[PDB]
Amino acid sequence: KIQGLVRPRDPYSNADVAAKDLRQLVDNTIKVASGTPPINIPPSMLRWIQKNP
Amino acid sequence: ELRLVDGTYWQRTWRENDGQLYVDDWISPTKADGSQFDEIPFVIFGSKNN
């Protein structure tokens, strides 16, 4: 964004004015990685009580 | 389970309810008129033959 994009000028005067510029700013989105800790799901306990693994 | 006893067709199904193992009773499917069957209605097809 240009702050002093507008200047009060005088058509009769001839005095110089300092310049500005088109700055460029950058947005961001950080990446997050998650997961699941190893969970024991052996078939033995489910089969023992006669249940589908 | 498909079985052929003395030239008749019988089949057993195993219910196996979710979390269990249950089995149906014996029963013999029969045609529109009756007479049961003489061969199992299960055909196995392969590249060479059936």
d(CA A27, CA B4): 75
Q: Which chain B residues touch A52 with a CB distance below 8 Å? A: 18-19
Nearest CA in chain A to B22: A50
* B17 lies within 8 A of chain A by CB: no
Burial class (CB in 10 A: 0-12, 13-18, 19+), B24: exposed
- Asked how this structure was determined, the answer is cryo-EM
Burial class (CB in 10 A: 0-12, 13-18, 19+), B41: exposed
d(CA A1, CA A21): 10
